[PDB]
Amino acid sequence: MTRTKLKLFVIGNSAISKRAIINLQSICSDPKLADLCDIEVVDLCKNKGIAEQEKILATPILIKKEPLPERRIIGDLSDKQKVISALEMD
Amino acid sequence: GMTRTKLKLFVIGNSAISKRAIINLQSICSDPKLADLCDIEVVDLCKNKGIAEQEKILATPILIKKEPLPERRIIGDLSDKQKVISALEMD
């Protein structure tokens, strides 16, 4: 079927940044997700115009870019079913 | 009875919201009745790795009142003077 596009936006390299990335990779390891989800990690400090462009304040923030509508969730992604529900990835 | 108010504004780059937060903070601190000894430093997080985690920073722009204790903070472009003043407990 059609792809789900995920972008994880973080500030630098911290304890919370690291475990949000691991948690995302864990979530998308689900066989139902592993071949349909494309994930990018975006450091806000490495493209200086992104926080303004995506209107990002609080981080880490996971944004499901595709398919529309965009869905967002703030935090370290430590609750799988919470993330899936919030991003409508059921 | 003079006591220094120390403010640190942490931003990411030279975006519109960074610009807003900086000039808004400057306007807020321009009030001579607000603080005796108002000291402000603006930190670009992009050029200072490690600072974000040390200040528990997860949102930008963010303004942190280091002095006087206890530490207070507020997130955003600081476009509301009164919210900012009360949030940092500067009366």
Task: Tell me the β-bridge partners of A62.
Answer: A8, A73
CA dist A64 and A84 (Å) reads 10
Q: What is the dihedral of CA B41, B43, B48, B52, to 10 degrees?
A: 100
Residues A17 and B45: beta-carbon distance below 8 Å: no
- The set of residues, in sequence order, having a beta carbon less than 8 Å from that of A38 and lying 6+ positions away, is A3, A4, A5, A6
Best of B46, B49, B51 to disrupt the A interface by mutation (most A CBs within 10 Å)?
A: B46
Place of tokens 């321009």: B30
**For B51, how many CA atoms within 13 A lie in the half-sphere containing its CB?**
18
Of A12, A48, A51, the CB nearest to B52: A12
d(CA B44, CA B8): 11
Please name the amino acid found at residue B54: Q
Give A-chain residues touching B49 at CB under 8 angstroms: 12-13, 45
Where along chain A do its domains lie?
Answer: 2-90
Torsions phi, psi for A16 (to 5 deg): -75, -35
How far is residue B27's CA from residue B33's CA, in Å, rounded to a whole number?
A: 13
Pairing of strands A4-10, A37-43: parallel
- Is the CB of residue A62 less than 8 Å from the CB of residue A72? yes
Approach to solving: X-ray
Question: In this complex, which of A15, A16, A45 lies closest to B12 when CB atoms are compared?
Answer: A45
Chain-centroid distance, C-alpha A34 = 14
Q: In 10 A of CB A65, how many CB atoms?
A: 14
Residue B64 and residue B55 in contact, taking contact as beta carbons nearer than 8 Å: yes
Task: List the single residue in A48, A49, A57 with the smallest CB-CB distance to B59.
Answer: A57
Architecture of the domain spanning A2-90: 3-Layer(aba) Sandwich (3.40)
Give the span between the Cα atoms of A31 and A9, in whole angstroms. 24
- Give the CATH fold of the B1-91 domain: Glutaredoxin (3.40.30)
B60 interaction partners in chain A (CB closer than 8 Å): 11, 44, 51, 57
Contact A11 B75 (CB under 8 A): no
User: What strands, in cross-sheet order, belong to the sheet with B5-11?
Assistant: B38-44, B5-11, B62-67, B72-75
Resolution in Å equals: 2.0
Asked if A48 lies within 8 A of B46 by C-beta distance, the reply is yes
For residue B36, count CB atoms less than 10 angstroms from its CB and return exposed for 0-12, middle for 13-18, buried for 19 or more.
Answer: exposed
Structure token pair of residue A46: 């490495």
